[PDB]
């Protein structure tokens, strides 16, 4: 059980790989690639991901270890602090072919991860799923299977700006800033209102009484206000006063410029040369 | 989920078997919310008879505190060390639900601990149970809680939930309205300034044209 | 509240005037109101421009200026021993009582803010009351005191945030 | 279909390359399209470079009057803004990476080069202009891309510019828009000297159908980071540098006023306005966050 942090760059890489292969081959085909990231204690984070070269004989898939090693040297040349983490594929639920390829990959690292992306999906949530290998004994026979992990989307400023720009692709400045904040606050409002409705509907009586959801709603309601402490208030007011002083200096500079223009015009008009 | 198994195996039991099962589930590690067991019609019917003490104990463990147990020690049946530890953990959770920076004095008073080492060991155990996430500050005599689980709720508590969620929704709507108004004001100001500058330039051009002729 | 409006009314009545000279009751009310509000410069100039005939006709202006001089010298025992020397009939009594209360409050605040160890006799002189009850009543207010040395230890006591920022940005960007 | 642009036509590319129409004209290439993945990789690499500079290569194609970019790959250089290209390490790396990508399915060819100008705008300096001139003289087409990973974070919008130079001795006929760009004092002479030898193409971004679906699915979980950004803390050294540069420019403007290019006070005022507006935006974001979260006292 290790906490996993995902990066939208990995998902974009996988989707572009699949789209490119489908367009090149005329018909959809599954792709196999590798992941790259950093592990700190029990926190695994993925950052980038390249593609691996594979062949099929009979009904089995084999990965070119020579190509993998050349790519490993190439990526270590650039990303010095990054390391191998696992492999990724496109499809549905795991298959015996996936178990075979995982067994093949396990000869390289100790416990590689496994990422699965589903291009053809009908659900509402992201089709990305993360698995790890677990070896068990069932009915006196040794078999290694998959265990699903829970992943969180990692935070990065440049990544956030790039992803938002790509998703949006669209006459002031306050305008734009406030519009972005508005979109996010709108999402929050929607979600909190749907939760309040469920809670009110459950209280009046319209849906079966659920205890876990109501307890979690109580816990959520007990989390407000967030950080009402004196040290936080002092830090917040420090920031506010700093920005206020910067705005004061900027206003003074602008007024000095306007004053200079007025003085120039007055000197030109009311002087006899 | 041990509570699901305890509910499943509690269908046919009653009386002494029910009380023994209640004691076992209260002593069982890991389970910290007892809502469905209290919701059981059989358990709620246990009130009539001479075993209402066990129902009162279950109610105390669902919604209760160590000072409540101390005040009602005589009526309730005796509890073992594991049950007392669970009640202390639930007291810590109840305090952290309403206060996010708990002083040491109130914790010591509530849990009836004598030295700081016992209280800090208890808080460390509660943290390790993954039912409360926080840090201990010795210099200021504080415990700072980042996360605490939601304890059991009554039927009349949900009014507070709906009130708080209504307040949050109203705040979000007010913020959205303010953002819209500010955007409109900024755009209007920019367009007004541009129009005024253009008008002044046009007047200057007209004056120059009529003067140069 | 009840004194600011009276001060404004007296000021306007003096300004209009039947030829510059106002009635002596209005002069006394205005002087005592200036003393109450700690407008020492205004009171000093008001006394200077009072005609000598009005000064000689009414003797209460002399006592009022005695109170004013005691306030000007910042001599609290003088203020307290000069306030309780004369009286009138409802014209200046409530405002002089308010002045006494204001002087008491100001002395308390000054002693609290500009002292860490004050002899009990000096504190009693500053406040105005004699020593015994003042030392009795400081403790109920939280001020430490100790006998055989009489050294009292005084103790020292919105949705428009976005609008202003938007205004600043709109001005800077123009 | 939208994925049609992702189809690589070897015959059409060969025909276009062998029937070069950009020779007769000079401003032939006027539109520059970039895929979503290429833009994201460029931005993340420029950001992870830090304060130093990083440079890579770009793989794409051409469709008539426009230049399409599909992929981008970094090359090591140890970065650190070395003198120029490489101790031959990058010289081997480019060919090695292209050959390795050829046998996987990345069958497109190089179209330009990108690099970062962290904190001092998006333009081509003298050495950049010479490099692009040399590249276009022999291998055609080729486009330069300049990124500003620091101004991107500061302003909330990507600072990406695609440029192409002019042949030696060619004098372009006026037509200079020359929108204002803030540039520090130590890098203003190069920008002034080398400014008419290149022109900026109009840049647009595109993405595939699966990419659009995945992004619209990802927003449902990515909306948190917008509300938990706190951009006023991540960019403080940049603001300090901007204030230092602005103070130096103000000193120069005062010296010009005392003495006897034109009206440096206006440029200093514009720089101060930009910096202050960015700071106030960063503050009002936190004010909104406080109003949303800290006041909803249960
Ligand atoms: Zn450069």
UniProtKB/Swiss-Prot annotation, chain A:
Highest rank taxon of the organism: Eukaryota
Main location: nucleus
GO CC annotation: COP9 signalosome; cytoplasm; cytosol; nucleoplasm; nucleus; perinuclear region of cytoplasm
Name of a matching Pfam family: JAB
Tissue-specificity statement: Widely expressed.
Keyword annotations from UniProtKB, A to Z: Cytoplasm, Host-virus interaction, Nucleus, Signalosome
InterPro entries: EIF3F/CSN6-like_C, JAMM/MPN+_dom, MPN, MPN_CSN6
UniProt-annotated location(s): Nucleus; Cytoplasm; Cytoplasm, Perinuclear region
Domain MPN, first and last residues per copy: 4-137
PANTHER family in the cross-refs: COP9 SIGNALOSOME COMPLEX SUBUNIT 6 (PTHR10540:SF8), EUKARYOTIC TRANSLATION INITIATION FACTOR 3 SUBUNIT F-RELATED (PTHR10540)
Family per similarity comment: Belongs to the peptidase M67A family. CSN6 subfamily.
The protein's name in its UniProt record: COP9 signalosome complex subunit 6
From Swiss-Prot, chain B:
Entire-sequence positions represented here: 10 to 222 of 264
Functional description taken from the UniProt entry: Component of the COP9 signalosome complex (CSN), a complex involved in various cellular and developmental processes. The CSN complex is an essential regulator of the ubiquitin (Ubl) conjugation pathway by mediating the deneddylation of the cullin subunits of SCF-type E3 ligase complexes, leading to decrease the Ubl ligase activity of SCF-type complexes such as SCF, CSA or DDB2. The complex is also involved in phosphorylation of p53/TP53, JUN, I-kappa-B-alpha/NFKBIA, ITPK1 and IRF8/ICSBP, possibly via its association with CK2 and PKD kinases.
Keywords attached to this entry: Acetylation, Coiled coil, Cytoplasm, Host-virus interaction, Nucleus, Phosphoprotein, Signalosome
Domain of life of the source: Eukaryota
Broad class of the protein's primary localization: cytoplasm
Coiled-coil blocks: 179-213
Family: Belongs to the CSN7/EIF3M family. CSN7 subfamily.
Organism: Homo sapiens
GO biological process, one term: protein deneddylation
Subcellular location: Cytoplasm; Nucleus
Quaternary context: Component of the CSN complex, composed of COPS1/GPS1, COPS2, COPS3, COPS4, COPS5, COPS6, COPS7 (COPS7A or COPS7B), COPS8 and COPS9 isoform 1. In the complex, it probably interacts directly with COPS1, COPS2, COPS4, COPS5, COPS6 and COPS8. Interacts with EIF3S6. (Microbial infection) Interacts with vaccinia virus protein C9L.
Keyword Coiled coil (UniProt): yes
A Gene Ontology term for the protein's cellular component: cytosol
This protein's name: COP9 signalosome complex subunit 7b
Domain PCI: 1-150
Signal peptide segment: none
From Swiss-Prot, chain C:
PROSITE patterns per UniProt: PCI
Subcellular localization(s) per the UniProt record: Cytoplasm; Nucleus
Keywords, in A-Z order: Cytoplasm, Nucleus, Phosphoprotein, Signalosome
GO cellular component, one term: perinuclear region of cytoplasm
InterPro entries: COP9_CSN8 (IPR033205), CSN8_PSD8_EIF3K (IPR033464), PCI_dom (IPR000717)
Domain of life, per lineage: Eukaryota
Domain named PCI: residues: 1-157
GO biological process, one term: protein neddylation
Family membership noted in the UniProt record: Belongs to the CSN8 family.
Assembly with partners or alone: Component of the CSN complex, composed of COPS1/GPS1, COPS2, COPS3, COPS4, COPS5, COPS6, COPS7 (COPS7A or COPS7B), COPS8 and COPS9 isoform 1. In the complex, it probably interacts directly with COPS3, COPS4 and COPS7 (COPS7A or COPS7B).
Task of the protein: Component of the COP9 signalosome complex (CSN), a complex involved in various cellular and developmental processes. The CSN complex is an essential regulator of the ubiquitin (Ubl) conjugation pathway by mediating the deneddylation of the cullin subunits of SCF-type E3 ligase complexes, leading to decrease the Ubl ligase activity of SCF-type complexes such as SCF, CSA or DDB2. The complex is also involved in phosphorylation of p53/TP53, c-jun/JUN, IkappaBalpha/NFKBIA, ITPK1 and IRF8/ICSBP, possibly via its association with CK2 and PKD kinases.
Protein name (Swiss-Prot/TrEMBL): COP9 signalosome complex subunit 8
Curated annotation (Swiss-Prot), chain D:
Gene Ontology terms, MF aspect: deNEDDylase activity; enzyme binding; macrophage migration inhibitory factor binding; metal ion binding; metal-dependent deubiquitinase activity; metallopeptidase activity; transcription coactivator activity; translation initiation factor activity
Alphabetized PROSITE patterns for the sequence: MPN
Required cofactor names: a divalent metal cation
Keywords per UniProt: Acetylation, Cytoplasm, Cytoplasmic vesicle, Hydrolase, Metal-binding, Metalloprotease, Nucleus, Protease, Signalosome, Synapse, Zinc
Principal location: cytoplasm
InterPro entries registered for this protein in UniProt: CSN5_C, JAMM/MPN+_dom, JAMM_MPN+_peptidase_M67A, MPN
Positions contributing to Zn(2+) binding: 115, 117, 128
GO biological process: exosomal secretion; negative regulation of apoptotic process; positive regulation of DNA-binding transcription factor activity; positive regulation of transcription by RNA polymerase II; post-translational protein modification; protein deneddylation; protein neddylation; proteolysis
Every MPN domain range: 32-169
GO cellular component labels: chromatin; COP9 signalosome; cytoplasm; cytosol; eukaryotic translation initiation factor 3 complex; nucleoplasm; nucleus; perinuclear region of cytoplasm
EC number: 3.4.-.-
Effect in UniProt of substituting residue 115 to Q: Abolishes ability to deneddylate cullins, without affecting the 'Lys-63'-specific deubiquitination associated with the COP9 signalosome complex
Chain ranges for the short sequence motif JAMM motif as given in the UniProt record: 115-128
Domain description: The JAMM motif is essential for the protease activity of the CSN complex resulting in deneddylation of cullins. It constitutes the catalytic center of the complex.
Gene assigned in the entry: COPS5
